[PDB]
C-alpha cells in the first residue's frame, strides 16, 4: 500500500546486512529510502544522508 | 540497531485532493512494538464507526488532524479518505 516513514534511523546499517531498497511515495510528509535487511527488517533512512546515497549505489552496483 | 525499533514504514490513508498522506490516528506498528507518530505528523481522527466504513474508495468524510503526544488533534478540515487499492 501507501507506505510512509514517520521516523528516520540515524545510525549506520552494515551493508552486509542489506538485501534491497525502495523509496516511499512522493506524497509522504517525509521523503525516505527504506532499506530491507536480510532478516526482513524495513529501516527508514534519510535520503539527504550521504551514507544512504552510498548504500544505494552499493546495492545498485551489484548489477 | 535497537533504537531503530520505530523506524519502519507504516501504511497511510489516501485522499482525493493532492494533499499529504496521513496516518490513521497517531500510532503504528513496527517490529513487535507499538510506536507513536512524531508531534506535528498529519493524521486522521476517525470514530470506531467511521473506521468500520473505511473501504478502498472515498466513502468516508475524515477529520484531518495533527499528532500531539500520541493524540490526533483535529484542525477542523474534512477530507474524503480511504485505504489504498
Numbering used by the authors:
A (entry chain B): 7 to 69
B (entry chain A): 17 to 101
From the paper:
To understand how class A3 evasins achieve chemokine binding and inhibition, we purified and crystallised complexes of EVA-A bound to human CCL7, CCL11, CCL16 and CCL17, and solved their structures at resolutions of 1.51–2.01 Å. All four structures display the same fold and 1:1 stoichiometry. EVA-A displays a rigid core structure comprised of seven β-strands and one α-helix, stabilised and interconnected by five disulfide bonds. In the EVA-A:chemokine structures, the side chain of the chemokine CC + 1 residue (Tyr in CCL7; Phe in CCL11, Leu in CCL16 and CCL17) sits in a deep hydrophobic pocket within the evasin structure, possibly enabling the ~35° rotation of the chemokine relative to its position in class A1 evasin complexes. Comparison of these to our structures of EVA-A bound to the same chemokines enabled us to identify similarities and distinctive aspects of chemokine recognition by class A3 evasins. On the other hand, there is a consistent ~35° rotation of the chemokine between the available class A1 and class A3 evasin-bound structures, suggesting that class A3 evasins enable closer interactions with the N-loop region of the chemokine.
Evasins are chemokine-binding proteins from tick saliva, whose application as anti-inflammatory therapeutics will require manipulation of their chemokine target selectivity. Here we describe subclass A3 evasins, which are unique to the tick genus Amblyomma and distinguished from “classical” class A1 evasins by an additional disulfide bond near the chemokine recognition interface. Structures of chemokine-bound EVA-A revealed a deep hydrophobic pocket, unique to A3 evasins, that interacts with the residue immediately following the CC motif of the chemokine.
